[PDB]
Amino acid sequence: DEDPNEYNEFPLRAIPKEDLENMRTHLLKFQSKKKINPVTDFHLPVRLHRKDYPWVMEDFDGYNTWVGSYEAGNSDSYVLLSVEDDGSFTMIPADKVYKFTARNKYATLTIDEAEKRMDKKS
Amino acid sequence: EESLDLDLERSNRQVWLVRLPMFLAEKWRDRNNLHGQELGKIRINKDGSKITLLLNENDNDSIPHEYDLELTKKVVENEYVFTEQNLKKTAIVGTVCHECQVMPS
Amino acid sequence: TTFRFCRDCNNMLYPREDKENNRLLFECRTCSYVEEAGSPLVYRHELITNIGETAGVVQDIGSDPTLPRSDRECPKCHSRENVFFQSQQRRKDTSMVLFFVCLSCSHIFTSDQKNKRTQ
Amino acid sequence: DGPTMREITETIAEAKKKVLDVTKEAQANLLTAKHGMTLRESFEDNVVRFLNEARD
Ligand SMILES: [Zn+2]
Ligand SMILES: [Zn+2]
């Protein structure tokens, strides 16, 4: 109909073909239950390493580690939309989505011993 | 840089995650990089928040059809985007502030 | 019953008695989490069940052609339009009582002339 | 016979109601099971018994 109203429309740059990380824009997802807070003095550092490939995420020692696994695909796909200072949007396709994928921990000096006790059970 | 390190999300940069239909993405690939690959535009309408996506005329010869977007919640999850460059440096680019699905039209 | 999980772990909660202040808690056996109990009831058996009777009553219940209709006037909207079925609790014992679901107000009324319900 | 057929039809007819009557009675939870039998088992026994009484 007629537009008595105003719309703010931004130009979308359908994905720029040539980007430095054009190849990789990925999603790292954490479950809310994990309660990971990026703003942590502790979580100032973080390392992301391929485990030889699930990704391994670790803070300084004494902190939790997470494992990242890749989710299955579909017909639709996800794009990351970022906005420049100028309103224009640049979109980038998500290369892969990973669900992380960390530790607990409190899994040391156990597991193998608990199973054995369980066996001392039958 | 520091090898194996992750970069800077601390800046709290926000980004949007949008689900697009495969056919639309296919069309988008067509756009020339040289052009800057301007696929089309996003419209934000008031009188309630409505967001739609429309393809550029160049993309197809017809009347551009708007693709409505369904806004969705973050869900009980925190989504962050990390990028890996050719250099293989890893950076924590931003957090997903809003999620949306572009419906097919 | 209706039980909780540990925020932080999401792992289930095991009851612990606070011997000193004579009160019930819920501990997490994966982390150091503890929370006080909502109810004193920890375990409920239930041998003579009634939960299953009015199962799968989707508002689309009217769209099942296999379901039979009756001209019984509703207790709420007084509508003589309703679909009916028997206790969906697939047990031998079970009575042949009927459950009527209103094709307007959606209220579940029974034919039970021995007892009075709310489910 | 023509009237024997009317008399037969009306024998089934009355037994058909006798059955509906026990069904309505069972749906209204007024039925009282025979010791050592389901409320349902007790009902089916009655239905089956009327219908045979009828055929005969
Ligand atoms: Zn816990
Ligand atoms: Zn009603």
Swiss-Prot record, chain B:
Signal peptide: none annotated. TFIIF is a general transcription initiation factor that binds to RNA polymerase II. Its functions include the recruitment of RNA polymerase II to the promoter bound DNA-TBP-TFIIB complex, decreasing the affinity of RNA polymerase II for non-specific DNA, allowing for the subsequent recruitment of TFIIE and TFIIH, and facilitating RNA polymerase II elongation. TFIIF is composed of three different subunits: TFG1/RAP74, TFG2/RAP30 and TAF14. Belongs to the TFIIF beta subunit family. It is found in: Nucleus. The modification Phosphoserine is found at residue 3. It comes from the Eukaryota. The gene is TFG2. Present with 520 molecules/cell in log phase SD medium. Coiled coil: none annotated. It comes from Saccharomyces cerevisiae (strain ATCC 204508 / S288c). This is Transcription initiation factor IIF subunit beta.
Curated annotation (Swiss-Prot), chain C:
It is found in: Nucleus, Nucleolus. A zinc finger (TFIIS-type) spans 70-110. Transmembrane segments: none annotated. Its main location: nucleus. SMART domains: RPOL9 (SM00661), ZnF_C2C2 (SM00440). GO terms for biological process: maintenance of transcriptional fidelity during transcription elongation by RNA polymerase II; RNA-templated transcription; transcription by RNA polymerase II; transcription elongation by RNA polymerase II; transcription initiation at RNA polymerase II promoter; transcription-coupled nucleotide-excision repair. PROSITE patterns: RNA_POL_M_15KD (PS01030), ZF_TFIIS_1 (PS00466), ZF_TFIIS_2 (PS51133). The modification Phosphoserine is found at residue 39. A zinc finger (C4-type) spans 6-31. Zn(2+) 2 binds at residues 74, 77, 102, 105. Zn(2+) 1 binds at residues 6, 9, 28, 31. One of its GO terms (cellular component) is nucleus. Pfam families: Zn_ribbon_RPB9, Zn_ribbon_TFIIS. Component of the RNA polymerase II (Pol II) complex consisting of 12 subunits. Belongs to the archaeal RpoM/eukaryotic RPA12/RPB9/RPC11 RNA polymerase family. DNA-dependent RNA polymerase catalyzes the transcription of DNA into RNA using the four ribonucleoside triphosphates as substrates. Component of RNA polymerase II which synthesizes mRNA precursors and many functional non-coding RNAs. Pol II is the central component of the basal RNA polymerase II transcription machinery. It is composed of mobile elements that move relative to each other. RPB9 is part of the upper jaw surrounding the central large cleft and thought to grab the incoming DNA template. Involved in the regulation of transcription elongation. PANTHER family: DNA-DIRECTED RNA POLYMERASE (PTHR11239), DNA-DIRECTED RNA POLYMERASE II SUBUNIT RPB9 (PTHR11239:SF1). Present with 2440 molecules/cell in log phase SD medium. This is DNA-directed RNA polymerase II subunit RPB9. It comes from Saccharomyces cerevisiae (strain ATCC 204508 / S288c).
Swiss-Prot record, chain D:
Belongs to the RNA polymerase beta' chain family. Component of the RNA polymerase II (Pol II) complex consisting of 12 subunits. Interacts with DEF1; the interaction is direct and serves to bridge RPB1 to the Elongin complex in a DNA-damaged dependent manner. Interacts with the Elongin subunit ELA1. Interacts with the Elongin subunit ELC1. Interacts with ASK10. Interacts with ESS1. Interacts with RTT103. Interacts with SHE2. Mutagenesis experiments demonstrate that the minimum viable CTD contains eight consensus Y-S-P-T-S-P-[A-S-N-G] heptapeptide repeats. Identical and simultaneous substitutions in a number of consecutive repeats are lethal: 'Ser-2' -> 'Ala-2' (14 repeats), 'Ser-5' -> 'Ala-5' (15 repeats), '2-Ser-Pro-Thr-Ser-5'-> '2-Ala-Pro-Thr-Ala-5' (10 repeats), 'Ser-2'-> 'Glu-2' (15 repeats), 'Ser-5' -> 'Glu-5' (12 repeats), '2-Ser-Pro-3' -> '2-Pro-Ser-3' (15 repeats) and 'Tyr-1' -> 'Phe-1' (12 repeats). The binding of ribonucleoside triphosphate to the RNA polymerase II transcribing complex probably involves a two-step mechanism. The initial binding seems to occur at the entry (E) site and involves a magnesium ion temporarily coordinated by three conserved aspartate residues of the two largest RNA Pol II subunits. The ribonucleoside triphosphate is transferred by a rotation to the nucleotide addition (A) site for pairing with the template DNA. The catalytic A site involves three conserved aspartate residues of the RNA Pol II largest subunit which permanently coordinate a second magnesium ion. There is a cross-link at residue 24 (Glycyl lysine isopeptide (Lys-Gly) (interchain with G-Cter in ubiquitin)). The gene is RPO21. This is DNA-directed RNA polymerase II subunit RPB1. It is found in: Nucleus.
